[PDB]
Homo-oligomer: A and B are copies of this chain.
């Protein structure tokens, strides 16, 4: 029975944070995990199987799918959320071991927040650069196995685009909250 130790550890982690910033960030993080695990996972389950191309050429469908989708949307978002969470876990464990040393910080917190914001911005920039922010029902594929210029069709472009819009909005809101936290610290300093 040491529930108070967890409370003290949580308090020390969030000591240098805005009153509303930390609560909004935590709720948004839980929201993002729930949305990614529950909803978008099922939508992308049959992205390759439902993919087809208007050709008889053997092997053209999967090479055209690979050209169309260099990396899957849900796996890219999993990478994004994991890299965003990494600095938070690092800071949590670091301050926990600092507390252990004290039993027998602000600057590192700033570096962690700045790295998380940089990760958000970089992931968003890559997500925009690779394919933009929307999915088209018809995809024109030019690949070596396929003869001339072949035509292929996506699984469910509209629903995927809608979920893309939600993920982009969530990323933007998280970035804005992190920038607000940085401005709050600059106000403190």
Partner-B contacts on A (CB < 8 A): 1-5, 11, 19, 22-24, 26-27, 30-31, 34-35, 38-39, 42-43, 46, 48-50, 52-54, 58-59, 62-63, 65-67, 69-72, 74-75, 78-79, 82, 86, 89-90, 93-94, 97, 100, 137-138, 144-145, 151-159, 162, 166
Nearest chain-B residue to A14 (Cβ)? B97
Contact indicator A82/B23 (Cβ below 8 Å): no
Q: Which residues of B contact A54 (CB under 8 A)?
A: 58-59
Binding site of A, secondary structure by majority: helix, strand, loop or mixed?
helix
Expressed in whole angstroms, the minimum distance between the Cβ of A129 and any Cβ of chain B is: 15
Q: Which of B27, B137, B158 contacts A90 (CB 8 A)?
A: B27
Q: Which residues of B contact A65 (CB under 8 A)?
A: 156
Q: Which residues of B contact A156 (CB under 8 A)?
A: 48, 62, 65-66, 69
Contact indicator A90/B23 (Cβ below 8 Å): yes
Expressed in whole angstroms, the minimum distance between the Cβ of A149 and any Cβ of chain B is: 15
Known contacts A23-B94, A58-B54, A89-B30: A43-B162 contact under CB 8 Å? no
Complex Cα–Cα for A143 and B152 (A): 15
Q: Which residues of B contact A26 (CB under 8 A)?
A: 93
Expressed in whole angstroms, the minimum distance between the Cβ of A76 and any Cβ of chain B is: 9
Nearest chain-B residue to A79 (Cβ)? B39
Expressed in whole angstroms, the minimum distance between the Cβ of A90 and any Cβ of chain B is: 5
Nearest chain-B residue to A65 (Cβ)? B156
Nearest chain-B residue to A26 (Cβ)? B93
Complex Cα–Cα for A2 and B82 (A): 32
Nearest chain-B residue to A100 (Cβ)? B11
Expressed in whole angstroms, the minimum distance between the Cβ of A159 and any Cβ of chain B is: 5
